[PDB]
């Protein structure tokens, strides 16, 4: 009964309110063991679909479109992601100079020391896109390796269509069809799961708001507005603009990508929302050849919301220390935060961890007694900021897919 | 050459005798490194099939039957399992008061202390039925998560059959067919494996009897009879009765579920026997829609033999301590042992571990110096008792599937 | 553009030269972080294919040929592998007495002590060929377990073809076709990957030669010639001979198995080359029923090049110690080195580790201060020797497959 897009908004609005209230009275623990579980069941159900829906769609997608086309689509969507994320940091910086988060704040040092996670070599990360066992990739998460194999297999099935043989052309057809069976079936699942969305959505915000809502005060409130205001400007000033320029009606784009944006925001998992954001890509009629490759790739490479969040935070820490950053250091943030964004995982609260990487680049390590005491303040309202960070991450992926879809 | 059902009985009877004899002369180690290996090869071969045969059968099964039907089947078979297991504990208690195992026994304390394995929250166990990656489920055991996904995919394929599109209805057909190919192929395997059954069966009892046969004396003999007598009464007084009531000839039910019962008994793995017990379900002509869902689920939820074993043992320990249990404590065993049974894994010697959980509930922890010295006595003949525990576990799953099958 | 077989030879010859030169000037580290990566990308791409290409080909292969035929093929190819490997050790010994590697050498003791890796029981290794979860096998490497399941499934699909039912015979067809789709697609991939071969090949030798080329002097040179000369005699004196005897033109056999031999040599992974060596088996028109089963099995069981390498080395260590081995000890090497060869993994530098196993059997453990200081000399030029060891390993697998193919 009832529309689904309506039910979510109710769950979201009524959820955010049931949370803030329960938590203000200290029931933050009662909400965690009682309400949250439902929000988790929603997440689990979505993660469930990611592997099959991604793999099966791309084999059909890579088999669908031209091998050179897919290659062009790739060069375009990568150019887009880089230019978006780079603009998102600079949009965050301009929000961190506009507002002043942690301007006249002095913090209690020594409270908590943080541990630096040593990053692996770029080379190793790149060669690890090519998986040594496809079955293993699928078996345990691993979206990007799967992306690689799927496209390869996709293109392989195509070349088996042109073969002179009858028995080869038939077996290739059969494989493709069954794989497409899975694909089609997976999108049908996302509908039924989207039915439990309102209940899940209610719970998910009920938890976040009860756990970190009441901490959104003082300088922590100012940084929160700084991020959200910026994010808002990323949508209006970057998406709504690039969409108009390319001849896509921005308003009916928001209408079609509503379920994706809200799942993203609530769930906090850029990757966990992927089956919803992939459906929404089918909804506005984009070709499987394009969205099937862009959305899963961008789900990891493209994070505007995260890049921006890292911008405003690198400025929060700097202001809390009392020393300002140079004209050239702000430009050194832009370039590092992009790299950090790309790096950030499609999972909740993964941007905050990556934030450290962009903190060394300016000149304020995370081991520094006081820096670490300021970074703990941010970490305390991180799930509040994360919801924003994720929504903008996802929007950017649809936007990019759309723009690249229209040009072809 | 020769019939298979005949060969097993020979292997079983001649195996049990070759074992008892070899072991009485201290060759318990000679049997383990020489004879057992063959019994293991039989187990490995059966485990081999479980994943494919379960998954592929349920996708076809869930796709076969009505979504509401499958749902009704579920409510019925769950009601059945609970009422069986609850009756099985009370049947065990009445066997533990009838016989008195460890009545006037005083044990050498301090011999061995046992370590309590802290259980996870019920919530966590329930949300973990919904897998976050189907490929992962399959990849590493995980029967229940697979059950969930398979049904979901099954129902998804069905809704793709009714689609207006031609290319969708065809791809959905193709997937289903191939998946069914696997299913059909897996049952054919179980035949060939059942051919090695006699050799395996011979070895498997040869080991159990040589390793723990000679320990079946004294108070350990009395508890052994107590369990077996009870188990026997579970079959005659609960299955043979509930089968007559529902209009199923009990005798030709035992005739058809012979291979399942014997594999179960010998193997000691409720789960490892699953491909045999699934074939036997096909043998008596039950629909894939029903047995495909009941048998794998009940293979973990339903354990009458284990529930009973836990009943008679909670009384063995209590009598060895010298203090009797209250009228209300016996009722507190019924309710805990059911929960423990459900909990017990479809693997050999897993009931004994769970026994601890039902031991705390009455008031005699497993850390208590002497309790633990009595529980070590039971553990010493556990594989003897386990064979019984498993057979009755499995019978109950077929029985339930049968009864639910007849009503529809 | 350009032929592929020509490009490789250029990469190989020009690669070996760019390596030796760069390394002689100490750029061994510059080659490792700059050039090698490309050689790795080539390896990754090949490993990628192994699982799918092996599995899918054998299901179709086992389904293709007679169950008794496949069984005969097995007995023949096993007899062949054993007799080859046994002849390869004796051919190495005769090379180690012909040349005298480490005759008058006295080494600096105490430099490096090595750690013995305790081997598992033969029984455990044999029962572990039968996998307890096929999906797991595939999921993580595990070629032999996959081999077992694939054949079983293959034979199962066949028996489903003869069924009286229509819906069974169709579903069995569908499965087989799709699985064959994968198979066919995988061979098409190996072509495209073989296109990157020259670049990879260039880099791969560029690294090996820069890293261990300059160490190929003195007594280390003499043992190197001893191995290579022997290997050469294994090809001419064992393959070219057994091929003529069975009516196969040796020269156009080398022409067809060129890509396999060179990938093998460069890559150093007997297993990593398997998709190339499997294609080359298709190239000379052998049946999927035969090569699909022989090549992956022999890829682990059959290692002539490794067996020989172990022969000449067991003599190098013995001569460096100063005590000669008995007539009967040389015969005790033959029998142990075969077992060690079979044991050696289809991965780079795995023969050297196994060498230890055949070192205990004569009477000179690897823990012995000085033995271990001599074994470290060998380990230093091991990748040089490994390239030879691998090529001959692979050749032997094609040879055997060919000979068994002709007899049928
Ligand atoms: Na994203
Ligand atoms: Na990212
Ligand atoms: Na059971
Ligand atoms: Na259980
Ligand atoms: Na080999
Ligand atoms: Na080997």
Instruction: Write out chain B in H/E/C secondary structure.
Output: CCCHHHHHHHHHHHHHHHHHHHHHCCCHHHHHHHCHHHHHHHHHHHHHHHHHHHHHHHHHHHHHCCHHHHHHHHHHHHHHHHHHHHHHHHHHHHHHHHCCCCCCCCCCCCCCCCCCCCCCCHHHHHHCCCCCCHHHHHHCCCHHHHHHHHHHHHHHHHHHHCCCCHHHHHHHHHHHHHHHHHHHHHHHHHHHHHHCHHHHHHHHHHHHHHHHCCCCCCHHHHHHHHHHHHHHHHHHHHHHHHHHHCCCCHHHHHHHCHHHHHHHHHHCCCCCCHHHHHHHHHHCCCCHHHHHHHHHHHHHHCCHHHHHHHHHHHHHHHHHHCCCCCHHHHHHHHHHHHHHHHHCCCCCCCHHHHHHHHHHCCCCCCCCCCHHHHHHHHHHCHHHHHHHHHHHHHHHHHHHHHHHHHHC
Confirm or reject contact between C173 and chain B (CB < 8 A): yes
Q: How far is the CA of C338 from the centre of ligand 6 (A)?
A: 9
Q: Report the SS3 class of residue A49.
A: helix
Residue A128 sits at the chain B interface (C-beta within 8 Å):
no
User: C190 alpha carbon to ligand 2 midpoint, in Å?
Assistant: 32
Residue whose tokens read 């490994």: C386
Provide the number of structural domains found in chain B: 1
Q: Per the structure block, which two tokens stand in for C159?
A: 């028996």
CA distance A118 to chain C (A): 19
Distance separating alpha carbons of residues C302 and B253, to the nearest angstrom? 51
Cα separation, A350 vs A305, whole angstroms: 12
Query: Pick from B177, B178, B188: which is nearest to C156 by CB?
Result: B188
Name the structure determination technique: X-ray
**Which listed ligand is nearest to B340 at the C-alpha?**
4
- Angle (nearest 5°) at CA B40 between B36 and B46: 150
What's the rounded Cα separation, in Å, for the pair A82 and A342?
Answer: 9
Spatial CB neighbours of B330, under 8 Å, sequence gap ≥ 6: B93
CA of B353 to nearest chain A CA: how many angstroms apart? 28
Dist CA B147 CA A157 (whole Å): 31
**CB proximity B178 to A under 8 Å:** yes
Chain C contact present for B50, CB below 8 A: yes
Q: Does C157 touch chain B (CB under 8 A)?
A: yes
Structure tokens at A390: 């994720």
User: For residue B188, how many C-alpha atoms fall within 13 Å in the half-sphere facing its CB?
Assistant: 20
Neighbour-count burial of C273, counting CB atoms closer than 10 A to its CB (0-12 exposed, 13-18 middle, 19+ buried): buried
Which residues is chain B interrupted after (C–N above 2.5 Å)? none
Q: Is C292 annotated as a binding residue?
A: no
CB contact A158 to C (< 8 Å): no
Residue A270 · residue A393 · CB < 8 Å: yes
Among chain B residues, CA nearest to C132 = B48
Q: How close is the nearest chain A Cα to the Cα of C293, in Å?
A: 20
How far is the C-alpha of C186 from the C-alpha of C194, rounded, in Å?
12
Tokens of A130: 């090519």
Beta carbons within 10 angstroms of residue C208's beta carbon: 26
Cα C342 to averaged position of ligand 6 atoms, centre (Å): 4
**Nearest-Cα residue of chain A relative to residue B167:** A177
Domain of B208: which CATH number? Answer: 1.10.3860.10
B interface mutation test: which of A184, A187, A203 has the most B CBs within 10 A? A184
Please indicate if the annotation marks B132 as binding a ligand: no
Question: In 3D, which of A124, A131, A125, A151 has the Cα closest to residue C47?
Answer: A131
Q: Distance between CA A1 and CA B184 in Å, rounded? A: 40
Residue C141 sits at φ, ψ, to 5 deg, of 50, -125
Size of chain B in residues? 408
CB A19 within 8 A of CB A207: yes
Neighbouring CB atoms inside 10 A of A252's CB total 10
- Taking ligand 2, which is a single-atom ion, which protein residues have CB atoms under 5 Å away? A 300, 303, 344
- Please tell me the distance in Å from B54's CA to the nearest CA on chain C: 12
Residue of A nearest to C140 (CA): A136
CA-CA distance, A28 to A210, in Å (whole number)?
5
Does B185 sit within 8 Å of C157, measured CB to CB? Answer: yes
Q: What is the DSSP letter of A238?
A: I
- Check residue A102 and give left, alpha or beta (phi > 0: left; psi -120 to 50: alpha): left
How close C309 gets to chain A, by Cα (Å)?
28
* Residue A268 assigned ligand-binding role: yes
- How long is chain C? 408
Token readout for C324 is: 């000669």
C174/A172 CB distance under 8 A: no
C187/chain B closest Cα distance in angstroms = 22
Selected for mutation to probe chain B from A48, A57, A136, A176 (highest B CB count within 10 Å) is A48
Q: Cα of C150 to ligand 5 centre, how many Å?
A: 20
Cβ contact C140–A153 (<8 Å): no
Task: Provide, as residue numbers in chain B, all residues whose Cβ is less than 8 Å from the Cβ of A179.
Answer: 175
Q: Which residue has the tokens 């280390």?
A: C220
Chain C 132-151, CB below 8 Å of chain A: which residues? 135, 138-141
Residue C51 structural domain = 1-408
Tell me the Ramachandran region of residue A268: left when phi exceeds 0, alpha when psi lies from -120 to 50, beta otherwise: left
Calculate how far, in angstroms, residue A345's C-alpha sits from the geometric centre of ligand 1: 9
Write out the two tokens for A2.
């009832």
∠ CA A80-A330-A358 to the nearest 5 degrees? 75
Reported structure resolution in angstroms: 3.8
Q: Is C361 annotated as a binding residue?
A: no
- For tokens 């005659």, the residue is B236
């Amino acid at each position: 009964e009832y529309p689904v897009l309506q039910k979510i908004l109710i769950g979201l609005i009524l959820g955010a309110i049931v949370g803030l209230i329960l938590g203000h009275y200290g029931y933050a623990d009662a909400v965690k063991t009682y309400v949250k579980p439902f929000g988790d069941l929603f997440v689990r159900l979505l993660k469930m679909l990611v592997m099959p829906i991604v793999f099966a769609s791309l084999v059909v997608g890579a088999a669908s479109i031209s091998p050179a086309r897919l290659g062009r689509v790739g060069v375009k969507i990568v150019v887009y992601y880089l230019l978006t994320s780079a603009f998102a940091v600079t949009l965050g910086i301009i929000m961190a100079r506009l507002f002043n988060p942690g301007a006249g704040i002095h913090l209690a040092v020594g409270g908590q020391q943080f541990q630096p996670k040593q990053a692996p070599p770029l080379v190793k990360i790149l060669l690890d896109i090519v998986p040594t066992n496809p079955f293993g990739a699928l078996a345990n998460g691993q979206v990007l390796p799967t992306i690689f194999f799927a496209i390869i297999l996709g293109i392989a099935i195509t070349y088996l269509m042109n073969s002179e043989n009858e028995k080869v052309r038939k077996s290739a057809e059969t494989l493709l069809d069954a794989i497409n069976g899975l694909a089609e079936a997976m999108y049908k699942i996302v509908n039924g799961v989207m039915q439990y969305a309102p209940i899940g959505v209610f719970a998910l915000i009920a938890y976040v708001m009860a756990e970190q809502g009441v901490k959104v005060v003082g300088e922590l409130a100012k940084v929160t507005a700084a991020v959200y205001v910026g994010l808002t400007l990323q949508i209006l000033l970057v998406y709504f603009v690039l969409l108009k320029i390319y001849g896509i009606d921005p308003i009916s784009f928001i209408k079609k990508a509503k379920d994706a944006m809200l799942t993203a925001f609530v769930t906090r998992s850029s990757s966990g929302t992927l089956p919803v954001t992939m459906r929404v890509a089918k909804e506005m009629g984009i070709s499987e050849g394009i969205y099937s490759f862009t959305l899963p790739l961008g789900a990891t490479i493209n994070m505007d919301g995260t890049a921006l969040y890292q911008g405003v935070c690198t400025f929060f820490i700097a202001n809390a220390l009392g020393s300002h950053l140079t004209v050239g250091q702000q430009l050194t943030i832009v370039l590092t935060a992009v790299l950090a964004s790309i790096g950030t995982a499609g999972v909740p609260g993964a941007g905050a961890i990556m934030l450290a990487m962009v903190l060394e680049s300016v000149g304020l390590p995370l081991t520094d007694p006081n820096v670490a005491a300021a970074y703990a303040m941010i970490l305390g309202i991180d799930a509040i900021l994360d919801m924003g960070c994720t929504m903008v991450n996802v929007t950017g992926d649809l936007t990019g897919t759309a723009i690249v879809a229209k040009t072809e």
